[PDB]
Amino acid sequence: EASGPKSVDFYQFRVCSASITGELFRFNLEQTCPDTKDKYHQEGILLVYKKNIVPHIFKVRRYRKIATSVTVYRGHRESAITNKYELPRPVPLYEISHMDSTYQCFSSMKVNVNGVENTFTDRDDVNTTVFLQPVEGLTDNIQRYFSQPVIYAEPGRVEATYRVRTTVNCEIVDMIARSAEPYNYFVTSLGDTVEVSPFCYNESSCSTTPSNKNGLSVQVVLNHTVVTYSDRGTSPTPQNRIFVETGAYTLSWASESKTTAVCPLALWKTFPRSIQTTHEDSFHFVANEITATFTAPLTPVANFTDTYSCLTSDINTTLNASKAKLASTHVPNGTVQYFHTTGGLYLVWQPMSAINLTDNLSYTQLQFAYDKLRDGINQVLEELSRAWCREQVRDNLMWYELSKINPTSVMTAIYGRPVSAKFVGDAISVTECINVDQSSVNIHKSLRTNSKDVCYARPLVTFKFLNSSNLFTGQLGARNEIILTNNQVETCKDTCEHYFITRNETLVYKDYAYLRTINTTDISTLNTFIALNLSFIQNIDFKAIELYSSAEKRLASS
Amino acid sequence: EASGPKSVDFYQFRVCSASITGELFRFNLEQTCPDTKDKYHQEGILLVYKKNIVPHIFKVRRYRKIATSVTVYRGHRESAITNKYELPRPVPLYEISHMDSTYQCFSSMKVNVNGVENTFTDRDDVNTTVFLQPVEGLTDNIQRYFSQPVIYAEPGRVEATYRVRTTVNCEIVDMIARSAEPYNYFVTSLGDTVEVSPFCYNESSCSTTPSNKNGLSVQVVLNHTVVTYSDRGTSPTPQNRIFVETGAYTLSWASESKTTAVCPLALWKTFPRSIQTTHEDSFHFVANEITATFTAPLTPVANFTDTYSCLTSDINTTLNASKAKLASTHVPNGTVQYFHTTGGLYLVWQPMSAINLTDNLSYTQLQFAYDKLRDGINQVLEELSRAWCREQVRDNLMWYELSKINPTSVMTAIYGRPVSAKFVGDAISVTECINVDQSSVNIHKSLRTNSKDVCYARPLVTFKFLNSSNLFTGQLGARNEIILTNNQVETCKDTCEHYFITRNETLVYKDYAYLRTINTTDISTLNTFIALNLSFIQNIDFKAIELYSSAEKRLASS
Amino acid sequence: EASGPKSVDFYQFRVCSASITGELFRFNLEQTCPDTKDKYHQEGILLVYKKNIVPHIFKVRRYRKIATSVTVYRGHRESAITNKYELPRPVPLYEISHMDSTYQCFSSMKVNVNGVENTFTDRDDVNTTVFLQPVEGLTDNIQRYFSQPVIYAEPGRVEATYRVRTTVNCEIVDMIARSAEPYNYFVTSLGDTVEVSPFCYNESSCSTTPSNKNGLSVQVVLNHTVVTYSDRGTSPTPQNRIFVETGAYTLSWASESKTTAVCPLALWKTFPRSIQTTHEDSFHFVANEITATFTAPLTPVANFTDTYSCLTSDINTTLNASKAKLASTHVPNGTVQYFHTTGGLYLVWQPMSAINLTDNLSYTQLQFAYDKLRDGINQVLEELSRAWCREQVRDNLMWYELSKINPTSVMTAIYGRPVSAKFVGDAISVTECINVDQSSVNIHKSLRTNSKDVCYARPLVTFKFLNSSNLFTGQLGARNEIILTNNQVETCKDTCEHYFITRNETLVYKDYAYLRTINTTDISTLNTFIALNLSFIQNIDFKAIELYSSAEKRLASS
């Protein structure tokens, strides 16, 4: 019979009506797609905790001994001729400053010098007692106490060279001291600076009963029992205290432990409603009250949050208050957890389940905006996909309905390669197609057959079965296809017009016979397209903007 | 007849050809959707106003009296043996400093002491007049004036103990003072600090003719008429002035009101082109020159912008200049308005209508980017929806065209539930379908009927009308459907092959009679689907980045 | 014949079956769309370079002469009665400080005074030599050297007025000095401030052999050969040095050029993998390790990066190391380039080609996020467009397949205006349509014709050919269309029902004749629509958030 290569494109004349049954195909009349289930999200109370920066504040008492002399008797009687060194000295502990601590009196006429011990006073006893008194000042936190505040005698009489009048003074000053986070040194309000740790001699090292230091003393007293009330003596508890003897003054302050006094964690904000969304390797806590999102590693890095013993007595109260407020429509679902974000902030998470009726913080806002946009885009894509699936199902149903007329057209539409088909029972049977000798083609110039009013609907063709020596007569179909049975006939009509398509050339029949071959493109080609004039997203550039120039910053000064 | 439950799925054999007319349906041949109208947006000139931080600057004049003594005559003749207290004193107002104000001379030999009034001088008159003079220095803003600048006599002769030579000095210093925003205290360039308000005795309280203060004087003089020109005397206006007598010096400066001198609002930028878009409860002003967007509440919070009386004379000029520049293609459309953003910046809005031919600022940039992305996405969605509507209209038209062959298939395609329909006149009439007894089914194993070449196209079936005792003969259709009229016949063909679908089982007829029952899935099922391999949007994490570490910040120091 | 206006809508009765051939149209059986080619992107090593802010650090040596006296013999024998001026003086260059530089001895008894040269000492020779020695202190960077450290003699014997004991001291202090970026002035660690440039007398101006300045000296010495080792004398190289003689002390430091010592560019980070994407007028370098993107102008603004001569010896090493590490799978492709971003950072770009197997930084993160979102959206749009093109091609094929039954319906579906078409061979010919006289219309109330069981399928109509005086008989079709040939007949059926449509009115035929005219809307209209319930993107507002309030900032203090 006829054999050869199988057709793969609509460019070579081919004929195929073989009765050999091929593959069997059926239309999938049942098709559907489901709807995704909503992914529920956990919620609960979220608390943040920024790093504290407020310095530690405590009160400190200072003692200082002042000795001054005036020598103004130049000529007959001069005034303010010259002044002495006025060197101040630390208060000695000969009486352990017990009288000063009593805030009642003190021993004047201090004796101390680098060369030899010499007593300086107003010509009185070496260990005379002078009653202290408070002096008012232009300060609400410096209750200075003065003894012998008036200037020296300064006789100003007729003296040859100068006078020798001099007095001594005892000074008790109350001030406030502040220390940084490391708590290794602190500076008082007056201005003095000392390089010792405020926390010592109480659950801390670098302090002992003997007095010894590099330029200091660092002496600790057990149950000092400071009266601490010069205006009205009282009976306070003998609290512990320490002393530091500098080169010119002595400072005293109560001893306290580093723990249970100051720890670096302060509450910033509380969000009664928050959403936690898991991810590949991190969490996401949403706080829409300030439009920010905090990310933390999946593992609860704060596995030992019991070291921060301070907050164990306040985070409980805040959580209790928040859950009491939210108890109307929410209940706890699990144990509390502590996380640690990359920015240095600590998060406290307490998941809650609904009850059935029956300055570097810009990246958080950026993350929030990105998450919102991504969620919106994903939801839109999901809806579009569902609509497309429904449309595809309907389209397939139409296709099946259309296939009931001629399966060959539908099969050639679905598969790019031309094929052939027939409705075996209720099942399409697909067979391949076979070409013929392209050179051996002959088309009659007249479609008018014998008799009358029975003219052929399509021109008759003759060809050879490829690699064979034989001739057959067929009728030209469509897309360069040959049909063995020539049953296409029609009644003759006056001024009949006909056109045919054959690859890049066309045939024209103004009458029952014509060969006005013209180009295929000469006839207009209609289009059925719904253009999608989509507009892409332009890409822009961002520029840094500074509110205040460097000139204004310099002009700010201090 | 036959009655029972109505079919709801393609799983039970059913037959329905009832002549009772049901509901009437017609194809909506006319369908269309409109295009949304563009929402025009207001535009106009927008000006921002940041909070001023530049400190107030004004000139201040200082007067001070200096008395010093030198006693160097130790042994035979010593030098620099000792110095006096050199205590400086404020300039007294015995002459009301009129001579000093004249910048011509001053009264030397000042007499003042805490004990008793003693006059110190170079052994001259108590009220002797000494002419002032200017002294050059290494400063471009300190025109210090000195009288008696040379050191004391210091005889250095043969004296037993020391000398008594001493002189006095009058000092006039011109300096510059700066004050913070509250204007409650200020510090001069020299270094002195005073806790009085720079604005006083002129539209301000805390100032009166009597001199009285807590450690100060705060004296006001009416029409002081300061010459203010030591190099060349002039005749200036008698401007008002005030004085403050400290413990060692006196400061003077001209009095000015708090208003009309310094107010905290400075212009930052001007945008001749901006867009205002309304929202649910806020406005949105777009400034694309710096890629930022400012949001303000809907209500014009700056309802009393007349309090800032300073800007009423400059915002008018800037607006006039901008509108003069833009008058080529724009004209004003409404009255000016003032807003107040959440960040603390003040906005000035002046809408303009086109003329017909015939450091915390990152959130603004974030808002700008979010708005741009949202607008682009919304526009894309609108275009997609319009294209989808056009496609749906065309699809409905194609469905109506297809319905002209057999309405039953189209109706069963549109409605999931199988139905029976027909073309009454030019309107489809749909009727419900009725099942039969599933158990009472019988299919003949041979489709070859009597005579020859008239074999049945489909096998004949027999069943009972559900809840009834009767038998009927029908022909099997498709999707388990029965047809009463058995007119499906065809010419007998040798080696005829047939297949049929019945729920999960199939029938095979290799000849005019066969019962090779096989599974339905044995035959391949072709697919007609255009997969939408959409790619979702991945979610990433942002990390904080610091340009300079804390070590570099510490190394910066001052 | 019949002529008049051409129909443009389905609202007027029209008839058109003209034999005149119109335009020729053919179905474009071949249609396809291509897939976009991936745009490859360059990659290579990217290095950033922030502006350096670390101040310059160098060592400085200071010399100072101190003279002090004590006069304490008041009464019989007093102590610390008074002190002298203790005026310090700069070390003179009588010996050019050669002995001090030798760190072995120095000439005591300095003679200097404003009045007349007087020698002060401990009653010794004017040019006596005293050996220097080092004194320990509480500092790890101040190796102070002291000569005559003990206090003056202070006889304290029985003297009438006072003593005259006095001593002099030579001080050599080693300190560290730091200077800002402009390098015009610097301040030492001790506290002294000098307004001279650290870089002078070596590839710099403002320095010369003669000593002259405004209050200073600025003297340069060639090959000073400072021993610089008091603990153990050595033999160092005679390096150059300079001196500055202040009013009380002299400072010395080694001279160095501004270049080759300190230049303001420090490496911040290195990214072995980066992507460069071109744009309209700028580049885009992606560094996903910190999620940031840097933008630079298209032109290599750093066209003269050879001025920064420091980095030419280190950027080469870093690039060599990075390319050695990446040589496993990458090789260089071009020459190095230098860019300059808008934020003030400098970028170094070195493109690399893969080898074939055979604190203001938020805007960068914002740009990165925007670019990622834009790329994702664009990719999604491209995929959607490709899927839509495939669907459109399939739809057009289905339309062509459907057109084989009746071209009139397909043509009227594609073109809104009704037309008339008829297949012409392979192609088709579509003509226009002509209306008739709307008033001249008559529809028979009975569709039952002569004989029996041959009743008309559609009612017969009679009308006039618009602007003409004639009558014709036709059959009503669909959408107000008239057909000349009345061949629509059917067998008579009992209880026949027929509804027909006509603009806004309908006809009902309960029997072979009826005129129950009712409204068209009375019959239900079925719909075939797949709703696209797209959800738009909500627009939100961002609010500025401050981590630490101003109160905490004030409490931080210093």
Residue numbers in the entry:
A (entry chain B), B (entry chain C), C (entry chain A): 53 to 410, 454 to 653
Article sentences:
We determined the cryo‐EM structure of the KSHV gB ectodomain at a resolution of 3.26 Å. This breakthrough was made possible by a novel construct, gB653‐mut, which incorporates strategic substitutions from the FL from HSV‐1 gB and mutations in the furin site. The KSHV gB653‐mut ectodomain, analyzed in our study, adopts the well‐characterized postfusion gB structure, forming a homo‐trimeric, rod‐like spike. This structure measures ≈170 Å in height, with a major and minor radius of ≈35 Å and 24 Å, respectively. The structure consists of five distinct domains (Domain I through V or DI‐DV), spanning residues 53–653. However, a certain region (411–453) was unresolved in the cryo‐EM map. We identified three pairs of intramolecular disulfide bonds (C68‐C528 in DIV, C85‐C484 in DIII, and C315‐C362 in DII) and observed no inter‐chain disulfide bonding, indicating a tight but flexible trimeric assembly. The FLs of the wild‐type KSHV gB consist of two loops, LT‐FL1 and WFPGI‐FL2, characterized by high hydrophobicity (L‐FL1; W, F, P, G, I‐FL2), whereas the KSHV gB653‐mut FL, HR‐FL1 and RVEA‐FL2 from HSV‐1 gB, incorporate with polar amino acid (H, R‐FL1; R, E, T‐FL2). In detail, the presence of acidic (E211‐FL2) and basic amino acids (R129‐FL1; R209‐FL2) renders the lowest bottom of KSHV gB653‐mut highly hydrophilic, with a negatively charged bottom tip due to the carboxyl group of glutamic acid, surrounded by positively charged side chains from the amidogen of arginine. This may stabilize the gB653‐mut ectodomain in a solvent environment during purification, compared to the wild‐type construct. Domain III (DIII) also consists of two parts, DIIIa (I72‐ Y92) and DIIIb (D454‐C528), featuring a central, long helix forming a trimeric, left‐handed bundle, providing strong interchain contacts.
Kaposi's sarcoma‐associated herpesvirus (KSHV), a member of the human γ‐herpesviruses family, exhibits extensive cellular tropism and is associated with Kaposi's sarcoma and various B‐cell malignancies. Similar to other herpesviruses, KSHV depends on the envelope glycoprotein B (gB) for host receptor recognition and membrane fusion initiation, making gB a prime target for antiviral antibody or vaccine development. As the fusion protein, gB mediates viral membrane fusion with the host membrane, triggered by signal from the gH/gL heterodimer—a mechanism consistent across herpesviruses. In this study, the high‐resolution cryo‐electron microscopy (cryo‐EM) structure of KSHV gB is presented, revealing a unique trimeric conformation resembling the postfusion state observed in other herpesviruses.
